[PDB]
Amino acid sequence: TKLGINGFGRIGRLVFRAAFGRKDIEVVAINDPFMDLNHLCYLLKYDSVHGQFPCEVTHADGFLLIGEKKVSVFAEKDPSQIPWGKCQVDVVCESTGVFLTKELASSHLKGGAKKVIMSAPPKDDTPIYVMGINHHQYDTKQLIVSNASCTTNCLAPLAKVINDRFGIVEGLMTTVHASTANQLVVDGPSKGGKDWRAGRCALSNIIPASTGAAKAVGKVLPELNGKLTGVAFRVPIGTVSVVDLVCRLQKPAKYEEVALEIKKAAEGPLKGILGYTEDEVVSQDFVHDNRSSIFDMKAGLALNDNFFKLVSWYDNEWGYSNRVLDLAVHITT
Amino acid sequence: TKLGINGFGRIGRLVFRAAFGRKDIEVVAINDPFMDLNHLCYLLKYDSVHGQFPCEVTHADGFLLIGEKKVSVFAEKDPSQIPWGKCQVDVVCESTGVFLTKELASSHLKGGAKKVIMSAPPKDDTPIYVMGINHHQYDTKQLIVSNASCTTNCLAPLAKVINDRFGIVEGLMTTVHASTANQLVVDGPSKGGKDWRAGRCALSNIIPASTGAAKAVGKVLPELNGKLTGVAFRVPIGTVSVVDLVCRLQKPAKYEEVALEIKKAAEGPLKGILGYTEDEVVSQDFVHDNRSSIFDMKAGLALNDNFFKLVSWYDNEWGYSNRVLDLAVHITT
Amino acid sequence: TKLGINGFGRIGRLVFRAAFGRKDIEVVAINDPFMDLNHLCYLLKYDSVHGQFPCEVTHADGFLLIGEKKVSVFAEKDPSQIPWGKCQVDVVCESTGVFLTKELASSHLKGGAKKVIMSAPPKDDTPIYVMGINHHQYDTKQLIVSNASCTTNCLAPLAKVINDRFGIVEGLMTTVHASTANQLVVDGPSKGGKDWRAGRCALSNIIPASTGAAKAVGKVLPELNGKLTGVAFRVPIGTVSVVDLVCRLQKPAKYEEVALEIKKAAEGPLKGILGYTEDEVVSQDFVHDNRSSIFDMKAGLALNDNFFKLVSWYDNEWGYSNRVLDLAVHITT
Amino acid sequence: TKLGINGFGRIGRLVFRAAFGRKDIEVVAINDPFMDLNHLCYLLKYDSVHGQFPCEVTHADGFLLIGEKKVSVFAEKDPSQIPWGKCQVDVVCESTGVFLTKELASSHLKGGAKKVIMSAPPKDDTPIYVMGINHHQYDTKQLIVSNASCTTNCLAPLAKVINDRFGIVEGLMTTVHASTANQLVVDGPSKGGKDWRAGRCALSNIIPASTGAAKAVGKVLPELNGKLTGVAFRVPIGTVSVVDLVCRLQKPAKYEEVALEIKKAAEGPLKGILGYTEDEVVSQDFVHDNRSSIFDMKAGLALNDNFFKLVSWYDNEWGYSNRVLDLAVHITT
Numbered sequence A, B, C, D: 001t002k003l004g005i006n007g008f009g010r011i012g013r014l015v016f017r018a019a020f021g022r023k024d025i026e027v028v029a030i031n032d033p034f035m036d037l038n039h040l041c042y043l044l045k046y047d048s049v050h051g052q053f054p055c056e057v058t059h060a061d062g063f064l065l066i067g068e069k070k071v072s073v074f075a076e077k078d079p080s081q082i083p084w085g086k087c088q089v090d091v092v093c094e095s096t097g098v099f100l101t102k103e104l105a106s107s108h109l110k111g112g113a114k115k116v117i118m119s120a121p122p123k124d125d126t127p128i129y130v131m132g133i134n135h136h137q138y139d140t141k142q143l144i145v146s147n148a149s150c151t152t153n154c155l156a157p158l159a160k161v162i163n164d165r166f167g168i169v170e171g172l173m174t175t176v177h178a179s180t181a182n183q184l185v186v187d188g189p190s191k192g193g194k195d196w197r198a199g200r201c202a203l204s205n206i207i208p209a210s211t212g213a214a215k216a217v218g219k220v221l222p223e224l225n226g227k228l229t230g231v232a233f234r235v236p237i238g239t240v241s242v243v244d245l246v247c248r249l250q251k252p253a254k255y256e257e258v259a260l261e262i263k264k265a266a267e268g269p270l271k272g273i274l275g276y277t278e279d280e281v282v283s284q285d286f287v288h289d290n291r292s293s294i295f296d297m298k299a300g301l302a303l304n305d306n307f308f309k310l311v312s313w314y315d316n317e318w319g320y321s322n323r324v325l326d327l328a329v330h331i332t333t
């Protein structure tokens, strides 16, 4: 399984990183035009949140070197001009943040790539998949797909398990989200005039933000269509975010029973995707945690037999980056 | 109205500051045994969040000097030993955090103080009052009372207005809360071994926390008893906190109607307590805002006609501090 | 004195705000093409550091409205086209960061501006001035000038006084610097690929940075040319930076005497530019302090009678912005 | 070597951790009365900076269990009451911060411990030892020693190398120091009324601080007595600090040569203690680096052939904790 990476940013680089540890998938090419090979290597060797790269990194003959493996590096603004074909790339991890329609992402297909995974929710009707939730509903005919957002990957397993046993009538979600590259260090104009709040100083603000993440749950779980939505607060934190789902349940239950059901899934049919802790955890405890969702039993509570607050952690960078690789293997195999 | 301050902390010093800009109330006496007079002045003079004290601040003969006015300074650990009576104190602002029961707080009365306000939720059944909400129900025969928490002061006005018109069936609250003095700069043991998470690094964590702030709305508004509770996440922010109320209503509404109902309350009955904004605000926009609650119209949303997320901001330090003075004025006059 | 502003960023907007107060200078025109008018009002009305604009900000018919005062707003990329002459502009504040040569800035003269001040050090041999130091050496024939950097404005007053009285033989400088717009919220590529370190996450890092600011003190004080240089460390701080000057003196001295000579200057001829304190201050105490440099007596020390560490604070945004105005007024009168 | 730990804080817990990977040293007993067993397991297991403990941490029958190995846990305020003798403790890591005196530390010897290491500079005459610089001078008859400060362990190796080769005429230091447990989350009164600035908000401030770490280098390298001193600035950073030495040299040198000397020291006699890099590094890159000092070639510079600014990083927590073990093993074998 040969992977290509378009946009060697936080997601691009950590996807590269997770892929090094996996035997079944291999990175063969990278593209980023805001980055010379000298600069690119620097940014990969050092990382402020996840530590240094697990082995030596040099460049040679326009390639990137990780032991006995060469990796092509390109610097093209236009995806139609990236030579994926010559590297026999099976899947392109589209992680720039600006090619989020079927039309724009199909430019990768023109360059010789077989299939594409947007590392974000699409702006159009592109099919969305969450590993562990609806990934088996994929078929090889779909060449361009989305792996949703980190928040959707955190929310979907939690909702699926609660909905199958108890039945979610309606739910509203809040995610307290770690910092992202779309934000600014000092009050300034946000990109293209959209989302003014995200241009406000990241270091000292709680910043309200819209998200479709919870509304997207209805795409990967049709049954919950129109039954979920939410908002986000961005806060000055390196990585790790948390979802807080307030939902009303059809079948009544104590909080103890809800927790045990989530424990059952995390230990059985959702091992590796959904996790369960009863510890007094805080955000830094999930730095570099590869799961999509870790239910925090003690943070949440119940108002009554039918109204619950359910709390789940996620490393927005690491968890998600591992899911891109899982999906990339799945669609190719 | 002659005020005394026990515990010259974040609340004590900002209570002193607010009272400096009011003619109807003045601080005559201060007690803090963990603070010598030179130290006290220094801490009053400078402030990391709210700037330098708007005044020449000095001391002489054991008195604090704010312009042409002398303030009495004490340093007893036992409140019983503070000569409040000789300073002719009408109300004592109990802002130490360690005298939150009617038995402990009554020693101020034994020191001569006529009345006491607990600047926090009580640990017993001491009466709780929130300006704008139930302060007219105060009986002068009550010598010791509590002004609740900053979070309750934010949530109750919001909940009141919404419940008066639409009726709240149930509700769960999250507050994303700024930093407080019970937290630690690096990972350590929390005082008494209680609330382990709050001992974790304040600078780099999202920290789950319990709170009775929502349950206690039921005390100030009996009609909502058993219908509200919540949780909190602490974040590395200087001041300003935000409440997210997910509530289910009986009378259906569009989001715009709910917003309008809050607007008219804010410009009418609850003017000065509850505020309204449709601007793209972030937390630092409410530093030194003296309102108890500021509804953020564009940050909230509705899922359907009976299920809402309503967002409100508060300067947990400065808002609450002015509330302590309005309650001090009320229970005296 | 009619001022125009090119680039409405941190320095652009803060010059604007500084000017609003003063009765001897006024902003008549603004230009910034990465900013729609509605968005410009938003950035002007709210500030994460210096609080809400002390006045109603609106717009109508393409004009910025401050109360009832109309300010003209353009969105041009070629300063030649900005109609400065139409607005009778005496000085243009060049605060984009990308017109720092004589060739580039002189497009403002062809647009009708009478003179230009660069809000940064120049790339070429454009004359540099610092108020209090060498501003009297400016002659009216010079149409394009520079106000240097915030750091140079901090150091040069301190440098002049120490060298005037004692004689600086050599010296080296570290500034610990607040965060600036050239930095990123998460690890990424810095612009143009210059200074890889500045692209590293700003929230969690101490980031070494080059600075010519200390070498630039030679150009404003020829006598010290070759005898000073230094480096910088960027830290997660909103505003306020500190200079730390290690230096050797020709004539020997005690720390007290050095300190008293700075006190004499700060309360005498350099009043308003160089300040002095013996208080136990921290960076937040100089937020919105309009002086160029404030010497911190207790923070510095001597090793011997010829070798000293001298410490001085500066709000790198506010002090500098006010300096820009002083220069503008000076060069016009 | 059987190690005991009094004070299970940042240094205590990370000393425990480093030992877990060392065969030449083992922890048999811990004392910390501010933290019961359930709480102590939590703090060991989770770490906000260095990640989770790399092992299952549990407890039974009053013992801390790291796998099969049982560790005794006392809760004793009076260090003379700890029964170190019953556990055959060779060395006590005295890392509480409140027993920095021969007389006070010697109460560990009454408990049965053979020897004691102060994890900090002493308040009295106690012998200081930096590994790699002066440790070989230790005599087995000295039962109580100090391992100096993180800052001194960073500057000493550098100063040694520079002085041996070029001759340090005089020097002044500045350290930018990561956050420490003596600071406060919000403006407050520091312990004992000492160091007022350390009580100011850790999250939002650059905070000046005194330090004898530079002067103490003259104690471990007598040739440098009276030639070094300096100051510190605290910044909102989890761990990793930097030293900035401005020094005059007796023999003139090109900066390239000064770097080359440090390189061969780091690859030869000071391998493991003193490090060297030419990479564009930032503070986060040295998290969990076990060296005491990492020279940063590109950060520093020279003013002339005699006057240099030399820059070096250190993980104040992890580097130091590793040196405590080295000293413990050395004073026992």
Ligand SMILES: NC(=O)c1ccc[n+]([C@@H]2O[C@H](COP(=O)([O-])OP(=O)(O)OC[C@H]3O[C@@H](n4cnc5c(N)ncnc54)[C@H](O)[C@@H]3O)[C@@H](O)[C@H]2O)c1
Pocket (backbone or CB within 6 Å): A006, A007, A008, A009, A010, A011, A012, A031, A032, A033, A034, A035, A076, A077, A078, A095, A096, A097, A098, A119, A120, A148, A149, A150, A180, A181, A182, A316, A317, A320, C186, C187, C188, C189
């Ligand atoms: N970081 C997260 O928490 C997170 C989680 C899940 C999904 N995502 C999504 O992944 C995407 C990338 O996010 P990120 O956080 O890595 O942002 P980022 O800014 O760190 O990375 C984007 C990278 O793409 C590069 N790029 C820009 N234009 C390009 C072009 N024309 N061609 C090729 N490369 C280009 C940039 O130089 C940059 O390195 C976004 O859509 C984001 O929403 C982010």
Ligand SMILES: NC(=O)c1ccc[n+]([C@@H]2O[C@H](COP(=O)([O-])OP(=O)(O)OC[C@H]3O[C@@H](n4cnc5c(N)ncnc54)[C@H](O)[C@@H]3O)[C@@H](O)[C@H]2O)c1
Pocket (backbone or CB within 6 Å): B006, B007, B008, B009, B010, B011, B012, B031, B032, B033, B034, B035, B076, B077, B078, B079, B095, B096, B097, B098, B119, B120, B149, B150, B180, B181, B182, B316, B317, B320, D186, D188, D189
């Ligand atoms: N800061 C907020 O966001 C906020 C908002 C609302 C309510 N409160 C409440 O107000 C109370 C104080 O909060 P704070 O943040 O100001 O805490 P703080 O640490 O800033 O202040 C507590 C002060 O009490 C003093 N003190 C301790 N023991 C004392 C005693 N024995 N006698 C006299 N003084 C003593 C301390 O010296 C300290 O200055 C708490 O109960 C808190 O819940 C805080």
Ligand SMILES: NC(=O)c1ccc[n+]([C@@H]2O[C@H](COP(=O)([O-])OP(=O)(O)OC[C@H]3O[C@@H](n4cnc5c(N)ncnc54)[C@H](O)[C@@H]3O)[C@@H](O)[C@H]2O)c1
Pocket (backbone or CB within 6 Å): A188, A189, C006, C007, C008, C009, C010, C011, C012, C031, C032, C033, C034, C035, C076, C077, C095, C096, C097, C098, C119, C120, C148, C149, C150, C151, C180, C181, C316, C317, C320
């Ligand atoms: N903030 C400080 O501490 C400080 C202090 C001293 C000097 N400076 C200098 O002042 C300059 C500006 O810095 P800043 O901090 O305001 O950064 P900033 O990003 O806040 O300001 C730049 C602004 O200029 C605008 N702009 C960019 N290109 C433009 C163009 N070609 N035409 C018109 N407008 C354009 C942008 O919209 C932006 O708002 C820099 O050169 C900086 O070195 C900054």
Ligand SMILES: NC(=O)c1ccc[n+]([C@@H]2O[C@H](COP(=O)([O-])OP(=O)(O)OC[C@H]3O[C@@H](n4cnc5c(N)ncnc54)[C@H](O)[C@@H]3O)[C@@H](O)[C@H]2O)c1
Pocket (backbone or CB within 6 Å): B186, B187, B188, B189, D006, D007, D008, D009, D010, D011, D012, D031, D032, D033, D034, D035, D076, D077, D078, D095, D096, D097, D098, D119, D120, D121, D148, D149, D150, D151, D180, D181, D182, D316, D317, D320
């Ligand atoms: N943290 C650093 O960057 C660093 C680096 C070098 C040296 N040091 C030194 O190490 C010492 C400890 O620092 P820290 O950062 O670990 O502080 P810390 O606050 O994290 O740890 C101190 C521990 O001692 C415990 N304690 C208090 N009184 C006690 C008593 N009577 N008996 C037993 N335990 C008691 C506390 O509960 C706490 O857990 C300080 O003197 C400091 O100067 C710290």
Ligand SMILES: NCCc1ccc(S(=O)(=O)F)cc1
Pocket (backbone or CB within 6 Å): A096, A097, A180, A181, A182
């Ligand atoms: N360079 C900006 C790319 C980008 C755009 C959006 C995000 S998001 O995760 O906030 F949606 C992250 C990064």
Ligand SMILES: NCCc1ccc(S(=O)(=O)F)cc1
Pocket (backbone or CB within 6 Å): B096, B097, B180, B181, B182
């Ligand atoms: N001195 C610490 C006392 C204290 C105790 C509690 C708080 S709280 O507002 O977080 F509940 C704040 C301060």
Ligand SMILES: NCCc1ccc(S(=O)(=O)F)cc1
Pocket (backbone or CB within 6 Å): D096, D097, D180, D181, D182
């Ligand atoms: N309990 C606080 C103990 C302590 C005391 C001092 C420090 S210091 O490293 O700043 F000198 C660190 C920790």
